[PDB]
Amino acid sequence: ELAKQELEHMRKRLNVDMNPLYEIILQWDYTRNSEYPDDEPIGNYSDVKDFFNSPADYQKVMKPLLLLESWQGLCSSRDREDYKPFSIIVGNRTAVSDFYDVYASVAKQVIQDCGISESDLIVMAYLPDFRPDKRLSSDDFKKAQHTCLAKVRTLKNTKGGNVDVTLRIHRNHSFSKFLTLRSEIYCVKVMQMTTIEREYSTLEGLEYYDLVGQILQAKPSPPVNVDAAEIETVKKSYKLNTSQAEAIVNSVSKEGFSLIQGPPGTGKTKTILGIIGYFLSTKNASNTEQLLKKQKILICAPSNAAVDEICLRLKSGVYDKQGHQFKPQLVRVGRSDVVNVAIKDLTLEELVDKRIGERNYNYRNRDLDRRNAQAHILAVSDIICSTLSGSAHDVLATMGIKFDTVIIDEACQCTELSSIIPLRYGGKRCIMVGDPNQLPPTVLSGAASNFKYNQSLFVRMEKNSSPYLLDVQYRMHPSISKFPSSEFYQGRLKDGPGMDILNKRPWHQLEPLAPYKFFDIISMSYTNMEEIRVAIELVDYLFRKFDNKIDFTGKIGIISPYREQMQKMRKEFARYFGGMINKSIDFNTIDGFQGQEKEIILISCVRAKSSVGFLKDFRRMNVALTRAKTSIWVLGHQRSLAKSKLWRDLIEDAKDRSCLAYACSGFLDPRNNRAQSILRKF
């Protein structure tokens, strides 16, 4: 019939109650030494299931894991963050629900120096034997007998450079006995609660989401049938390859969830730009003038960096189905981490500044003008870009706008609730673009990750459906892309035209500095001095032969699965080369290097159980083998690695391709008779 229940469900999704969240959190013990926030039985926790039967099933599984990650965040900030303590003067209190709203006073300079905002959780402590003689730290709170968690409800500036503070604590907390009028109480910030609150809002309002069925079942929509002429038109107009054009056309033509899988360098973001252009143009091409809200698209990413790259690349305009450029109105919701004028000019706050001018350079008028400008800018916008968390912001929540189409870049680098956040505005189509063949997003709680909390909705859905694969990479030398393609993509991952030309480098003319090489080192620990020495000698030969013609600044990375081996590698490289390699070589583990790339990559394999273990090794190898663009030199012991199918496949592929060389310390030295004898007798 007429579904005003859409408006009712929108209201439900946008107004989730946080009091149940703080009923739990405000009873926690800041001083607790445990992976877990309480002593409930371990069986209360369970793995994230491939398939959920109901929103209640989903919530029963997910809420403990969300709270566990939150607890681990508390612990991390307690044991590391070194937040600066302060003190407050207590006043009256008000009983609200299962809470006490305690009013207090603190200086504005202290609020600013300690970084306290209305989004912060803090811990209070009673330390009557403290004297200003000593410096106060969060260790004093960690070891205190009487502590209490409090949420910063309200911060209001007063006249004399002070701030009225409203803090919320739990009714049941005995610490209230110390909150007598005009008492001095010591405090320190624990953590800012915005992300936890937004994910909790999503988790609890899930049952009113339009795509709740597809989310619970991890089951994207079935493919519809699309016109080959349409795919060709998109290909030509947007200057894409066939896989990208197909992904765009299909994912836009259907509603529900769509998965686009992009291996390294296959054009995930370019395809998203094409999606934006195509969607907006085909949507604009559908007795007194009726007033309608303008169609918008929501573009989200897990991190500010990805959102900012999307914005920067959108500044060149988008294209319609016929290939003609148009410039839709773009708004970046939320301030970014880095400073850049090009991104700053797109932020909602800067757009409001420019729309209102110097008229209010009186305070009521200033706030009213800012609010009206915000409303108008958001109403006339075409594209809304944000982080997955930032999509839950009040500025979007008060637009009165349904965002029926949400696109997510880097969709594998976020938790499931985080990816679900932006669907609260009536989302009926969600196109997630990602690379599942990487390491899962990092979570603070090892236990939570052991319960598979570090798994993205993209991956959980990939279990049940085949994504639209982008199958041409535009980064790596063909000798470097060869084995990744054959080993992970059925030999169907293609190279862009001229990768051999683009990634041809002078040192390629000198053996063994080839584009692709496995060095079998002829010589139960997690380090290998001989691999380290061979890496040193390779880099030394490269430098000696070319660093008077080539600047190796930022050209080289060295990675290994094991941080012990990487520590030893950095130490030995520092000793051998001095400081002159600081700007030439990055050192990291395969995990820590996941988002980086170099022209030259050296891998120290060192050495090579379960399905989880094979999955982690599969992802690590996918990452490691795609970090280089022009040259990759894989150092390892063949017998120490061949117990792994992946490594044996790699070594035997290198053999078949004549890309295996035998190596030991001094193998590049013609005068080293010992090393040359070791080589010759092989």
Ligand SMILES: Nc1ncnc2c1ncn2[C@@H]1O[C@H](COP(=O)(O)OP(=O)(O)O)[C@@H](O)[C@H]1O
């Ligand atoms: N159809 C295409 N034709 C030519 N170059 C492409 C195509 N698709 C992607 N590229 C190139 O591949 C590189 C990776 O682009 P990007 O969209 O950032 O990929 P991803 O987002 O998957 O990392 C870019 O330099 C881009 O110019």
Ligand SMILES: [Mg+2]
């Ligand atoms: Mg990208």
